[PDB]
Amino acid sequence: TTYADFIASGRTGRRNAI
Amino acid sequence: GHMGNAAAAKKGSEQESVKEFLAKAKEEFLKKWESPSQNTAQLDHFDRIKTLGTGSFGRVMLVKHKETGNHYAMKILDKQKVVKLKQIEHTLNEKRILQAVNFPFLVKLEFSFKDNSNLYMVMEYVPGGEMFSHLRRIGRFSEPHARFYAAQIVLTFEYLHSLDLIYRDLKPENLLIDQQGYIQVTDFGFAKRVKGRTWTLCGTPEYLAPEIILSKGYNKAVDWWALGVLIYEMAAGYPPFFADQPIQIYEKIVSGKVRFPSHFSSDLKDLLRNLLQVDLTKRFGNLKNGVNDIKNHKWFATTDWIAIYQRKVEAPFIPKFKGPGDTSNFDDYEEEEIRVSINEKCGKEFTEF
Numbered sequence: 001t002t003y004a005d006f007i008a009s010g011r012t013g014r015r016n017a018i
Numbered sequence: 019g020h021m022g023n024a025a026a027a028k029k030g031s032e033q034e035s036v037k038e039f040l041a042k043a044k045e046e047f048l049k050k051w052e053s054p055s056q057n058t059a060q061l062d063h064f065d066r067i068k069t070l071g072t073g074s075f076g077r078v079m080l081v082k083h084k085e086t087g088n089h090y091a092m093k094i095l096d097k098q099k100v101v102k103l104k105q106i107e108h109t110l111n112e113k114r115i116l117q118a119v120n121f122p123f124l125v126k127l128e129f130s131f132k133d134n135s136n137l138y139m140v141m142e143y144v145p146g147g148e149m150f151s152h153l154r155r156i157g158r159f160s161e162p163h164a165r166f167y168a169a170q171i172v173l174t175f176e177y178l179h180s181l182d183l184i185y186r187d188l189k190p191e192n193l194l195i196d197q198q199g200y201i202q203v204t205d206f207g208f209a210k211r212v213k214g215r216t217w218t219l220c221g222t223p224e225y226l227a228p229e230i231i232l233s234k235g236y237n238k239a240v241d242w243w244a245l246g247v248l249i250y251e252m253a254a255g256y257p258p259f260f261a262d263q264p265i266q267i268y269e270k271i272v273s274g275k276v277r278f279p280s281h282f283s284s285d286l287k288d289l290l291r292n293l294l295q296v297d298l299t300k301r302f303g304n305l306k307n308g309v310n311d312i313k314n315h316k317w318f319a320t321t322d323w324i325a326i327y328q329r330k331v332e333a334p335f336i337p338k339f340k341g342p343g344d345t346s347n348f349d350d351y352e353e354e355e356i357r358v359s360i361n362e363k364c365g366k367e368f369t370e371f
């Protein structure tokens with residue numbers, strides 16, 4: 001599912017700028 | 019047509035009043051922009067309480083003003099580290115913007131000063147912490163809840179863009195929630211006064227507009243793209259474009275395809291397709307009718323824009339109040355000293371601060 005894909009991305013925490 | 023006479027006249031009048039407000043707000047901004055405030059407190063006016071965050075060149079600390087007992091969030095930047103990281107102009111610009119703007123959803127700079135070692139920005143303390151934590155905890159916001167926050171961002175961008183400021187770092191991590199449940203925007207490190215186009219690659223991968231990724235000159239429409247990403251993330255619980263690595267995120271952003279959860283209303287999907295529009299000649303916020311294409315969209319039909327501005331709408335969520343000065347909505351960090359050298363560092367570079 002999309003939610004599971006989001007968890008799998010490893011990008012669920014705070015995101016840094018470029 | 020879509021509106022009878024009374025409704026059309028009311029809308030027209032409201033839109034003209036916005037123009038009148040923005041013209042006055044620009045006059046006020048330009049006076050402060052041309053003559054910035056400096057040196058309005060000193061370090062020994064404050065007691066340090068707790069570190070709220072720590073990063074590359076600086077820290078944010080909860081402090082208490084010794085005489086009033088009021089709590090503030092003090093950003094501390096090490097001048098030598100700012101120079102080494104090539105952040106002089108961004109640091110001076112962030113302070114210059116903060117002292118010049120005035121809007122109910124932009125954090126206020128209450129004092130600023132510098133000493134031999136550091137620069138200090140003393141801002142309002144916003145005890146609800148970042149939207150990010152609340153969103154990840156609750157999972158997703160219902161559409162009315164997302165809309166309440168979205169409306170505040172629309173008005174804030176309408177204000178900033180009228181001053182020719184592009185914001186460039188919208189994301190839940192940068193939106194704080196106050197004790198009345200309203201948003202406070204804090205970080206102006208990527209903001210720029212831009213009447214036309216600009217070219218810098220900056221922002222956060224999930225929130226970057228296609229034209230930034232494609233190394234184009236770009237304009238304030240990147241902020242309207244980012245609003246689409248934010249609304250999507252608030253309502254879904256995850257952003258529209260994600261992947262394990264940024265390059266795969268960028269491929270999705272430029273593709274012109276976005277998919278929606280089945281619980282999104284048709285009105286929400288229509289708004290998002292018009293904000294997350296790769297073609298700049300078609301993106302809402304970038305057309306002849308400007309911000310009004312967004313404000314007049316069906317998804318916002320229940321939004322009383324003036325009541326939001328006046329903070330008269332009851333918020334859908336009030337962060338748990340645990341006392342003036344509680345820090346529960348911020349993370350815990352090791353407490354480090356605030357060192358002040360006996361010798362002035364980088365004086366010339368920071369004269370304007």
Ligand SMILES: N#Cc1cc(-c2cccc([C@@H]3COCCN3)c2)ccc1N
Pocket residue numbers: 070071072078091125141142143144145191192194204205348
């Ligand atoms: N209250 C308050 C207040 C808090 C912050 C702050 C405190 C901790 C962490 C962060 C990170 C800073 O960069 C990443 C996104 N948010 C910001 C910044 C400004 C403030 N006025």
